[PDB]
Design an enzyme around this catalytic site. Structure first.
Site, short mmCIF file in Angstrom:
data_model
loop_
_atom_site.label_atom_id
_atom_site.label_comp_id
_atom_site.label_asym_id
_atom_site.label_seq_id
_atom_site.Cartn_x
_atom_site.Cartn_y
_atom_site.Cartn_z
N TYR A 143 14.23 -20.88 46.04
CA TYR A 143 12.52 -22.37 45.58
C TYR A 143 14.02 -22.74 43.83
CZ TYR A 143 9.65 -22.10 48.39
OH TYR A 143 8.55 -22.25 49.46
N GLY A 171 2.13 -26.36 51.13
CA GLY A 171 1.38 -27.45 49.99
C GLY A 171 2.41 -27.65 49.24
N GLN A 224 1.11 -1.33 0.21
CA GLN A 224 -0.21 0.04 -0.06
C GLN A 224 0.90 1.18 0.20
OE1 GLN A 224 -3.62 -1.73 3.30
NE2 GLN A 224 -3.56 0.36 2.11
N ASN A 239 2.14 -25.39 42.33
CA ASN A 239 3.90 -25.17 43.05
C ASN A 239 5.16 -25.46 42.67
OD1 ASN A 239 1.18 -27.64 44.03
ND2 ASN A 239 1.61 -26.12 44.86
#
Ligand SMILES: C[C@@H](OP(=O)(O)O)[C@H](NC(=O)CCCCCCS)C(=O)O
Ligand SMILES: C[C@@H](OP(=O)(O)O)[C@H](NC(=O)CCCCCCS)C(=O)O
Ligand SMILES: O=S(=O)(O)CCS
Ligand SMILES: [Mg+2]
Ligand SMILES: [Mg+2]
Ligand SMILES: [Mg+2]
Ligand SMILES: [Mg+2]
Lengths: 246, 442, 548, 442
Positions: free
Chosen positions: C332, C444, C146, C480
């Site tokens: 972690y 948990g 275009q 977890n």
């Protein structure tokens, strides 16, 4: 009941903690008042706050189960649910996290027990928690050097001991008196200073710790050498696996 | 029948009702009362006419704190509820004298609506109930007051909320036990996405009826999921009978024996004793001062273990009259029984695992909440296949007022409307009677 | 020889690693740390500038009553404080995720059929190269048809491009090599022959959209962005009408029919579109990691590079921000790729297997699981018992459980050549760990681990799946820390031991064997260290369009 | 009867079958053939036993180009198909003489599975069909070859794909006409998320039967969505009759009168003439050399205009034997008819609007594709409430091979299996006969 397999002192100690017939050795005397101060939920003399009315004023519905299960005293009263939480050193603390939770639900009624690596907690109705907390503090569940009452900042279960053989504590809630060989609690479990410290007695010696501990370690009694305990764990793993498939 | 098993059925007061009933008379696929409950749940809608009226008066529509100033409409909906309800019923019903039901409650403030079963015979799922109910009440309100074309879109907003800009009926003044199909964690989960608080609300906090309705919904979902097919069908039927329907009075008796002084550990001892006596388990091997137990029927051991699990919940949380500890009971009942017996815990560890995350996500910062907001579709508590959630229902039924997010906070509309349906409020009565009525056809 | 973690322990603590006692409370709190000192002063400046208090060391409890440890990035000699491994502070970890998020693989096989059959034109290596020259102009955001189009600034979008690969060596040699991922040059000979056999005569594009767009938008943008500029480049290079019916076949091909997303969309509770971390299966992650084509002689190294890739992505960015946030889950994750601890445990297990069974020669059954996973679990746990410094290093139980079980599970998979028995060994390790120390992880931690044994071999609807196909949306796994990255390593382990060229998808493996990526996927752990030292240069910054 | 309208019903060759049938005899809520078609689609699954075998032999499971080296299993599934099918049937059925159906096709390469209706009575939605079928075949295959615990998980992956890591059954070797409930654009949309190619495949490219099946699915969804309730019910019934069921032979007659030489414009002229003859529209006003038409029954005008729309598609796309132009027909038939008459077009502009976006998204770079991949649940084509998609089905039935994503590319498994069910392949027959049988109970 048999509670736990194994032929080590550790296994026997795990069984004793769970066994409601086994009389926990009382090692120290703590006043009812000092239990309340350690817990930190209310001041001695203060009345128990309530979260709901007494059960007798509620008129609750016909329910054969309710009729058949006697509530604990604090539930009748409408007490808050509050907590006590302990951290246990891996250097031969008598009690350890899963031992606690397993033992609480064999010994106590209306208990919400949770196990973590660095903390173990029990939540129940306030006045019943105070009776339980006295036994948890007075008996062999607790050593004032290798165990700690901590509602927050629990770091320590895995750390090296200090030069006095005390477990690490961010907030230094329990202080060893080098000039007298006794441990004093100088803050409540959430870290606020107490008006007057509480005497927790003498640390157990390492010989006695080894005799009473519930942790397996290579420098104590190793889990791999308790073959009957290992065998049962491997069995549960196998039967769970087969059950899940067919 | 495909299975040889038979069970004695009892009522919620511990009384015998029928002896030696084939196990499959309790099956969701065969029992007509379970069919009635499931179809009733699919087709029952609660409408809050007081809420529709207040939302229009204040132009508070589309979700929390939302308001469009200048769009207020003052209409006397509660004061004309009888005429609105009747016009709605003619639109909802398929034929005169079908099973359509529209009842006003609280003086026109609420409406119980049961959409005709025929509409679900030619439907793929269950959303026809809220959507047919919603548009019928919207049209009836517009017609009752000659609401203009220019204003009628506010009535729509007041009934169904921000839908369809939101995917849910955000801000709606209708309520169902089921949630929208898009929110399923997986195909076949719809009957599990019913909040525990809703179950407790509909059963008016009767412990055994809440346990029964929860077990019916959970185990019926296990058929829709395909989990109770083939080799697993018997396990799930036995779990439904023993854990949720008080088969052989095992749950009732365990609670009777342990309710005055018992703990979780003492319920375990009694259960092991009973399993040995009934021949479910046998001594397989002796270690040093420790017997290893075995079983020739794992599905029956599971069912016995699951009945004790119920009883332990009833005893522990009933003593505290506080629901929160159910996550602890679900964990340590199963952890203790495994080292007591050498046999696997309920659902082969899955209840224990569910309880671990359920404990964490009901005592931490990361998510979840109180016990009553969980359900079998919740990512935290979906893992056990029907054996954990009914214990949560029982524990919340026993809670005396320790929860901030109680059934009264989350499920008031369910309490008021769905508890009116007899099969929802006392499902144990109807399932057991229907099983006796078909015992010789199985 | 010393255990591999000893040097790190000696640099962290004044004591020798075996000593049981130390002193606390006299380090000066946060003042012991250069990084915490930098943070305190920055917080004062931020507060002053914006008029709202911010970082303040006197809020809450006093950090630093113990030694605030440095960490060794495993396989390097770089020691950094843990804050330099937080994903917010580490541009290498952010770019790793951006390079995955902004990537999609798009076939040209349907597209070329449409050309030949529907339009009746010819496809030759010459037209392909012209198409590739066009699409490398268009893909970053520039126009081809275009009039009066406005365009992206080429320097802001320099990291976006399109390459192709194919198993047909003859076509590959005809195409300009700037556009070609040469399987023969990037892979060892045995691996190259397996990969070429999988791809065959198919021709596939690796599309990378601009980082600045990925950061402004989301992962579900990638396949859409890719498809629009493929469509314009097809219009331009093959002289269609600029918008006829056949244009729609190309759009359907590129958006749906021959597209490989890196991740699939997620259900509503954790609603996310495609190419977000939760949709990336463990098999894909192992194949994105390029350790397998450089370190193939050492199956431990390959496997643990995958663990590092996944531990960072899944625990720090995905679980620690997308699904929670705040301070997050740095440590972690770092437990799995610092201080050479996991490497020690896993090299031990590999030696055990190789001596007793030989790699991949053990029976694929539960006897092998009970043997290898038990032995490796007891070895790892014993190291924490013999070295108090190690236990104070990995102070959280969750951390220890993940590291020990990863060694056990990887080692079991080294023995059996099968990832499903490796997975069983992971869960057995957990059970033994829990009974040995009467603790495991956080509140948990073992939801999936108690569900674990029964769901390893299940075949039911939402339970049964080969590990390679599982991922962060597998139900038990969805919540977890301390599992997902380690599972990706177990998925890689048997394939590393067997010498397989890929774990789950050869197209994914090939698509990241590309030297024009910003992150170096052949040396994940080295890149994390470079980012920690603030020496990594990411894409997608806006310095060019902002004031001095 | 609620509505006094009556219709003449014909067959797919233009012969009259029954005179003066009451409209509601065609209603999804009343007509038993429609109920049978809907319940059939919910409960029918195709199992590709050949694909399962090949996926296991190559370990190619879990999606495009996926493969797990070292997991290959070589099982002769096709050669033992009869025994596997029998074992699976025993697991899928509820009782020994229920409507369970398992039939082998292509000499055991494929299986047609119809899960028993009873399982859906106590189900919330429709996912029981794939889930129960998948697990029965997984278990049957494991039991046939004694596949070990260690290997069985590969059989699961070959049958159901990457589920549950993926939300869909990605890589599965089963097929249904319905898709998973999580992919609904909105509640109640399930019967709309059936690809047009699937409909054309199942009716073997018979134009009128394709139109009829599409119209039955679309308009039945309109009842599940609540769109055909109250004031709108009659409009949707008339649309079903006149656009999809060739009521009064109107579609047929318009195609006959225009098939040789006609255009969209000439169909429009014939339709306006007919609506005048039958008194559906009347001249309301004269402008300068221009008659403005009005109507006393907008719903009947809409139905006539809907029939002409169907005929225009048939004439225009039939002349080209190329489906792409259906997007143009749906647009300009309605654009032209509005300025021809001064009345609103079909679905009050919604067909025209749907056609605008549908044209764009079937002729551009931005999305969509060819006509055959659209459906009533597609974001591009959901907007008209049942009056657009049936024309797309007709256009694709008439395509002679201009499409790359043809039904043979997207729906081969549906062609082989679902076309075996008579009510899916020839629905116009069964629905008309069923309307005749009940015409007196309405
Ligand atoms: C459980 C669920 O939270 P809700 O109960 O829906 O609020 C879910 N969060 C999580 O899974 C938290 C995961 C990351 C933090 C815990 C890491 S162990 C979520 O936000 O979608
Ligand atoms: C139609 C649909 O595309 P698909 O048919 O699913 O490929 C949809 N795209 C769009 O709506 C493109 C909108 C932006 C570009 C056009 C603006 S006029 C989407 O990607 O989900
Ligand atoms: O203490 S909890 O286990 O709840 C969270 C650990 S990050
Ligand atoms: Mg005293
Ligand atoms: Mg009795
Ligand atoms: Mg570089
Ligand atoms: Mg005139």
């Amino acid at each position: 009941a048999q509670y736990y397999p194994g032929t080590t002192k550790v296994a026997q100690n795990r069984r004793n903690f769970c066994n409601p017939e086994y009389e926990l050795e009382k090692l120290r005397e703590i006043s009812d008042e000092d239990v309340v101060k350690i817990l930190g939920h209310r001041a001695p003399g203060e009345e128990y706050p309530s979260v709901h009315p007494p059960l007798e004023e509620m008129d609750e519905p016909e329910d054969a189960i309710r009729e058949m299960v006697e509530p604990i005293d604090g539930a009748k009263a409408g007490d808050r649910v509050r907590y006590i939480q302990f951290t246990d050193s891996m250097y031969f603390a008598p009690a350890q996290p899963y031992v606690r939770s397993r033992a609480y639900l064999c010994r106590y009624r209306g208990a919400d027990a949770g196990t973590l690596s660095g903390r173990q907690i029990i939540e129940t109705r306030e006045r019943d928690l105070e009776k339980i907390s006295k036994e948890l503090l007075e008996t062999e569940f607790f050593d004032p050097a290798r165990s700690g009452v901590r509602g927050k900042s629990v770091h320590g279960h895995s750390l090296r001991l200090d030069e006095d053989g005390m477990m690490f504590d961010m907030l230094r809630r329990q202080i060893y008196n080098k000039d007298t060989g006794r441990v004093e609690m100088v803050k409540n479990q959430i870290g606020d200073e107490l008006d007057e410290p509480v005497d927790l007695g003498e640390p157990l010696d390492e010989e006695t710790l080894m005799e009473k501990t519930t942790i397996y370690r290579v420098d104590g009694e190793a889990y791999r050498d308790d073959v009957e305990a290992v065998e049962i764990m491997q069995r549960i793993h196998v039967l769970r696996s087969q059950g899940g498939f067919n | 029948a495909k299975f040889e098993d038979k069970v004695d059925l009892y009522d919620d007061r511990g009384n015998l009702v029928e002896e030696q009933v084939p196990l499959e008379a309790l099956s969701p696929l065969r029992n007509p009362a379970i069919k009635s409950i499931v179809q009733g749940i699919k087709r029952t809608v609660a409408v809050n006419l007081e809420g529709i009226e207040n939302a229009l008066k204040t132009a508070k529509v589309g979700g929390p704190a939302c308001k469009i100033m200048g769009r207020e409409l003052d209409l006397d909906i509660v004061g004309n509820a009888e005429s609105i309800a009747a016009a709605a019923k003619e639109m909802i019903q398929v034929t005169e004298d079908d099973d359509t039901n529209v009842e006003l409650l609280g003086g026109g403030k609420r409406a119980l609506v049961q959409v005709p079963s025929a509409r679900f015979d030619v439907a793929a799922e269950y959303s026809a109930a809220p959507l047919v109910t919603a548009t019928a009440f919207v049209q009836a309100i517009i017609n009752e007051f000659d609401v203009s074309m220019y204003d009628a879109n506010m009535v729509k907003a007041a009934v169904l909320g921000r839908y369809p800009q939101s995917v849910e009926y955000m801000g709606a003044n209708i309520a169902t036990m089921l949630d929208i199909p898009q929110k399923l964690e997986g195909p076949g989960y719809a009957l599990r996405n019913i909040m525990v608080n809703h179950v407790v609300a509909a059963t008016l906090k009767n412990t055994l009826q809440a346990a029964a309705l929860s077990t019916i919904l959970e185990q019926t979902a296990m058929f829709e999921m395909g989990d109770a097919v083939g080799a697993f069908e018997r396990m799930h039927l036995l779990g439904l009978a023993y854990q949720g329907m008080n088969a052989d009075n095992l749950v009732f008796d365990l609670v009777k024996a342990n309710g005055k002084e018992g703990t979780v550990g003492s319920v375990i001892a009694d259960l092991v004793e009973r399993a040995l006596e009934d021949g479910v388990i046998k001594v397989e091997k002796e270690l040093t001062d420790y017997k290893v137990y075995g079983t020739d029927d794992l599905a029956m051991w599971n069912a016995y273990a699951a009945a004790g699990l119920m009883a332990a919940t009833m005893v522990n949380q009933g003593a505290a009259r506080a629901a929160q500890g159910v996550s602890s009971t679900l964990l340590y009942y199963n952890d203790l029984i495994e080292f007591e017996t050498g046999l696997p815990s309920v659902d082969f560890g899955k209840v224990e695992g569910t309880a671990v995350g359920f404990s964490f996500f009901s005592h931490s910062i990361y998510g979840g909440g109180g016990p009553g907001i969980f359900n079998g579709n919740h990512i935290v508590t979906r893992h056990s296949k029907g054996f954990a959630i009914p214990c949560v229902a029982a524990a919340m039924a026993l809670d005396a007022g320790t929860q901030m997010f109680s059934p009264e906070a989350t499920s008031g509309l369910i309490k008021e409307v769905f508890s009116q349906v007899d099969e929802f409020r006392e499902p144990l009565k109807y399932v057991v009677e229907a099983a006796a009525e078909i015992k010789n056809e199985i | 020889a010393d255990k591999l973690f000893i040097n790190a322990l000696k640099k962290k603590f004044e004591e020798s690693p075996e000593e049981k006692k130390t002193t606390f409370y006299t380090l000066g709190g946060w003042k012991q740390s250069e990084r915490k000192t930098e943070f305190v002063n920055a917080g004062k400046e931020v507060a002053a500038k914006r008029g709202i208090p911010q970082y303040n060391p006197d809020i809450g409890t006093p950090l630093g009553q113990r030694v605030l440890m440095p960490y060794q990035v495993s396989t390097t000699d770089t020691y950094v404080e843990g804050d330099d491994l937080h994903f917010v502070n580490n541009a290498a970890m952010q770019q790793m995720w951006d390079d995955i998020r902004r990537t999609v693989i798009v076939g040209l096989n349907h597209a070329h059929a449409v050309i030949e059959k529907r339009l009746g034109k010819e496809v030759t290596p010459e037209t392909i190269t012209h198409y590739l020259e066009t699409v490398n102009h268009a893909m970053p955001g520039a126009a081809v048809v275009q009039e009066h189009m406005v365009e992206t600034h080429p320097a802001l979008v320099a990291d976006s491009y399109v390459k192709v690969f194919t198993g047909n060596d003859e076509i590959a040699d005809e195409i300009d090599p700037a556009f070609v991922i040469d399987i023969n040059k990037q892979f060892p000979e045995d691996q190259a022959e397996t990969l070429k056999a999988e791809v065959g005569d198919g021709i596939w594009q690796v599309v990378r959209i601009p980082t600045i767009v990925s950061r402004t938008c989301d992962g579900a943008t990638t396949s859409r962005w890719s498809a629009m500029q493929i469509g314009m480049s097809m219009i331009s290079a093959y002289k269609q009408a600029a918008g006829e019916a056949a244009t729609g076949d190309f759009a359907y091909a590129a958006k749906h029919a021959e597209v490989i997303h890196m991740g699939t969309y997620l259900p509503v509770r954790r609603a996310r579109g495609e190419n977000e971390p939760g949709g990336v299966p463990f098999g894909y992650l192992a194949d994105i990691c390029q350790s397998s084509r450089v370190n193939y002689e050492d199956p431990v190294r390959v496997s643990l590079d995958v663990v590092a890739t996944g531990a960072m992505l899944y625990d720090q960015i995905w679980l620690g921000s997308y699904m929670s946030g705040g301070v997050g889950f740095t440590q972690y994750a770092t437990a799995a790729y610092t201080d050479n601890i996991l490497d020690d445990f896993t090299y031990f297990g590999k030696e055990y297997v190789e001596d007793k069974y030989g790699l991949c020669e053990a029976p694929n059954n539960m006897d092998t699981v009970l043997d290898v996973a038990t032995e490796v679990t007891f070895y790892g746990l014993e190291q924490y018992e013999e070295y108090p410094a190690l236990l104070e290093d990995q102070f959280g139980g969750s951390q220890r459980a993940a590291v020990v079980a990863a060694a056990a599970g990887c080692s079991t998979a080294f023995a059996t050549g099968n990832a499903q028995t490796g997975l069983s060994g992971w869960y057995l390790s957990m059970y033994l760990h829990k009974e040995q120390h009467s603790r495991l992880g956080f509140y948990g931690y073992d939801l999936q681990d108690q569900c674990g044994a029964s769901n390893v071999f299940s075949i039911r609807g939402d339970e049964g799946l080969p590990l390679e196909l599982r991922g962060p949306n597998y139900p038990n796994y969805a919540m977890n820390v301390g599992h997902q990255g380690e599972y990706a390593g177990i998925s890689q382990a048997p394939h590393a031991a067997r010498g397989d060229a890929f774990v789950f998808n050869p197209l994914v493996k090939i698509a990241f064997a590309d030297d024009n990526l910003v992150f170096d996927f052949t040396n994940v752990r080295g890149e994390f260290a470079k980012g920690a030292l603030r020496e990594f240069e990411p894409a997608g910054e806006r310095a060019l369009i902002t004031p001095a």
